[PDB]
mmCIF file of all heavy atoms in Angstrom:
data_model
loop_
_atom_site.group_PDB
_atom_site.id
_atom_site.type_symbol
_atom_site.label_atom_id
_atom_site.label_comp_id
_atom_site.label_asym_id
_atom_site.label_seq_id
_atom_site.Cartn_x
_atom_site.Cartn_y
_atom_site.Cartn_z
ATOM 1 N N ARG A 241 74.766 150.587 93.170
ATOM 2 C CA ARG A 241 76.059 150.051 92.728
ATOM 3 C C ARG A 241 75.905 148.944 91.709
ATOM 4 O O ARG A 241 74.820 148.396 91.544
ATOM 5 C CB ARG A 241 76.846 149.499 93.916
ATOM 6 C CG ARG A 241 76.739 150.319 95.196
ATOM 7 C CD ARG A 241 77.501 149.627 96.327
ATOM 8 N NE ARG A 241 77.060 150.011 97.671
ATOM 9 C CZ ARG A 241 77.081 151.248 98.142
ATOM 10 N NH1 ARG A 241 77.515 152.250 97.383
ATOM 11 N NH2 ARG A 241 76.679 151.474 99.382
ATOM 12 N N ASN A 330 75.600 158.058 87.709
ATOM 13 C CA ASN A 330 76.772 157.657 88.463
ATOM 14 C C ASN A 330 76.418 156.591 89.477
ATOM 15 O O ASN A 330 75.451 156.737 90.225
ATOM 16 C CB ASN A 330 77.371 158.851 89.187
ATOM 17 C CG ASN A 330 76.515 159.316 90.338
ATOM 18 O OD1 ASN A 330 75.304 159.426 90.213
ATOM 19 N ND2 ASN A 330 77.143 159.599 91.464
ATOM 20 N N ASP A 332 78.480 153.128 91.860
ATOM 21 C CA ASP A 332 79.766 152.640 92.313
ATOM 22 C C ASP A 332 79.918 151.410 91.441
ATOM 23 O O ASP A 332 79.075 150.507 91.482
ATOM 24 C CB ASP A 332 79.718 152.270 93.787
ATOM 25 C CG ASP A 332 79.764 153.486 94.687
ATOM 26 O OD1 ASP A 332 80.814 154.172 94.691
ATOM 27 O OD2 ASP A 332 78.752 153.755 95.384
ATOM 28 N N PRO A 432 82.924 155.974 90.818
ATOM 29 C CA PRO A 432 84.031 155.359 91.545
ATOM 30 C C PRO A 432 84.134 153.928 91.016
ATOM 31 O O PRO A 432 83.206 153.134 91.172
ATOM 32 C CB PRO A 432 83.554 155.400 92.991
ATOM 33 C CG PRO A 432 82.744 156.596 93.023
ATOM 34 C CD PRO A 432 81.926 156.473 91.769
ATOM 35 N N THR A 499 79.357 149.579 101.502
ATOM 36 C CA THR A 499 79.790 150.969 101.415
ATOM 37 C C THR A 499 80.151 151.559 100.042
ATOM 38 O O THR A 499 80.196 152.774 99.886
ATOM 39 C CB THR A 499 80.978 151.166 102.318
ATOM 40 O OG1 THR A 499 82.150 150.686 101.659
ATOM 41 C CG2 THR A 499 80.805 150.368 103.562
ATOM 42 N N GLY A 500 80.415 150.724 99.048
ATOM 43 C CA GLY A 500 80.778 151.262 97.749
ATOM 44 C C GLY A 500 82.285 151.347 97.703
ATOM 45 O O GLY A 500 82.881 152.117 96.951
ATOM 46 N N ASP A 501 82.895 150.542 98.557
ATOM 47 C CA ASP A 501 84.332 150.434 98.663
ATOM 48 C C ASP A 501 84.565 149.012 99.144
ATOM 49 O O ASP A 501 84.135 148.639 100.229
ATOM 50 C CB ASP A 501 84.865 151.432 99.681
ATOM 51 C CG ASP A 501 86.353 151.250 99.956
ATOM 52 O OD1 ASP A 501 86.915 150.216 99.538
ATOM 53 O OD2 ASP A 501 86.964 152.138 100.597
ATOM 54 N N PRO B 69 81.144 165.992 98.137
ATOM 55 C CA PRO B 69 82.267 165.123 98.480
ATOM 56 C C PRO B 69 82.547 164.175 97.305
ATOM 57 O O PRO B 69 81.678 163.417 96.889
ATOM 58 C CB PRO B 69 81.766 164.394 99.720
ATOM 59 C CG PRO B 69 80.289 164.366 99.521
ATOM 60 C CD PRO B 69 79.999 165.751 99.027
ATOM 61 N N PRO B 70 83.771 164.211 96.765
ATOM 62 C CA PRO B 70 84.240 163.400 95.644
ATOM 63 C C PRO B 70 83.347 162.254 95.192
ATOM 64 O O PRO B 70 82.645 162.353 94.189
ATOM 65 C CB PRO B 70 85.583 162.916 96.144
ATOM 66 C CG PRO B 70 86.111 164.165 96.750
ATOM 67 C CD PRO B 70 84.925 164.729 97.520
ATOM 68 N N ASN B 71 83.388 161.164 95.940
ATOM 69 C CA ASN B 71 82.605 159.980 95.620
ATOM 70 C C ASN B 71 81.097 160.152 95.743
ATOM 71 O O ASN B 71 80.373 159.179 95.962
ATOM 72 C CB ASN B 71 83.053 158.853 96.523
ATOM 73 C CG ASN B 71 84.534 158.755 96.584
ATOM 74 O OD1 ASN B 71 85.171 158.349 95.619
ATOM 75 N ND2 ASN B 71 85.106 159.154 97.708
ATOM 76 N N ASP B 72 80.626 161.383 95.595
ATOM 77 C CA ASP B 72 79.204 161.656 95.694
ATOM 78 C C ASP B 72 78.709 162.691 94.707
ATOM 79 O O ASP B 72 77.580 163.138 94.801
ATOM 80 C CB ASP B 72 78.858 162.090 97.105
ATOM 81 C CG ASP B 72 78.678 160.918 98.039
ATOM 82 O OD1 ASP B 72 78.503 159.784 97.536
ATOM 83 O OD2 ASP B 72 78.699 161.136 99.275
HETATM 84 CA CA1 CA E 608 79.377 156.713 97.869
#
Side-chain angles (χ1 to χ4, degrees):
Chain A
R241 321 177 202 301
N330 71 315
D332 283 294
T499 80
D501 173 348
Chain B
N71 314 289
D72 278 343

